[PDB]
């Protein structure tokens, strides 16, 4: 379960896609947290809609937007207006009850206008 690098030019919107099994994660909410170290924490930046049936509705939180496709099985994260302080390790999480499974490790790179 290694990392996938997503790089985007600073000042533009970065789209991070997280595919998953729509059958396995049926009825599970999704979250996008920022990992600051090897021992955590993965501070939740944004999560999907509180009602899983409305996962298609965009849930904004600062400059990070999240949207989920429960049928097609695709979690889309949007880092609107990239900033150099947004670079780091993140996680795509699938929430079920009290536990949380990791879907994909994402490394956000910021390019200075390459």
């Amino acid at each position, epitope marked *: 379960h290694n*990392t996938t*690098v997503f*790089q985007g030019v600073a000042g533009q919107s970065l789209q991070v896609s997280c595919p998953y099994d729509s059958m396995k994660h049926w009825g599970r909410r999704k979250a996008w947290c920022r*990992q*600051l*170290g*090897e*021992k*955590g*924490p993965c501070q939740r930046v944004v999560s999907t809609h509180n009602l899983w049936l409305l996962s298609f509705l965009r849930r904004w939180n600062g400059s990070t937007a999240i949207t989920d496709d429960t049928l097609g099985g695709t979690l889309t994260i949007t880092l609107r207006n990239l900033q*150099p*302080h947004d*670079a*780091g*390790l993140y996680q795509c999480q699938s929430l079920h009850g009290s536990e949380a499974d990791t879907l994909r490790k994402v*490394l956000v*790179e*910021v*390019l*200075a*206008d*390459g």
Partner: single-chain antibody
Amino acid sequence: EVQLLESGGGLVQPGGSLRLSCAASGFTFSYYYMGWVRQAPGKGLEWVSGISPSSGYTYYADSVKGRFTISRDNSKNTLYLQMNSLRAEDTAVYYCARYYYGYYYSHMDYWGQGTLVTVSSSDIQMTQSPSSLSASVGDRVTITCRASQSISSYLNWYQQKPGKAPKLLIYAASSLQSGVPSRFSGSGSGTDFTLTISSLQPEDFATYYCQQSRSGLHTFGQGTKLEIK
């Protein structure tokens, strides 16, 4: 395993030029931010420069801006630091350090043993209240660290044994780095932070520094000498 091998140090006259080289192995060098930290002989740590994986972002300190030039070659896994117009103020032991994923809000988890350079013939300050602290084995020591402005909960604590490279203990205000024993603990938010050791050990007698990590200049603290009472 991870190795940060430094080279390119020695003696130089004022106004000379040197090129510090830091060969890296064990980690994907094109993923992490890199940075240089020098330490004057018998003084505290000073953050020098930093660089982005794509080399598009170069952060320099005020004392070395314009004269130093940080660079990297991801194809050869090497970090460079071109030093020009070397004044007598630059006499220090330069350390090569790698940042964990990210730069802002991140921490230096791996350091090089350091190379010696001897010149022969959004600005926040960090102040540690106990400059010289003396305690015995088993005492309860609590070192503090005050910031000039709000730095949220992004502060790091480093332990530097006399004659070796500094090691990372606490990062992100209160997170314990992998490998650090459970005796160390951190706390604090905003502008006041504390480093607490429950019971001291024979290997805990060293120097401890606090480093802020919210702006582009990750300045260190003045230091705290911790020896036997």
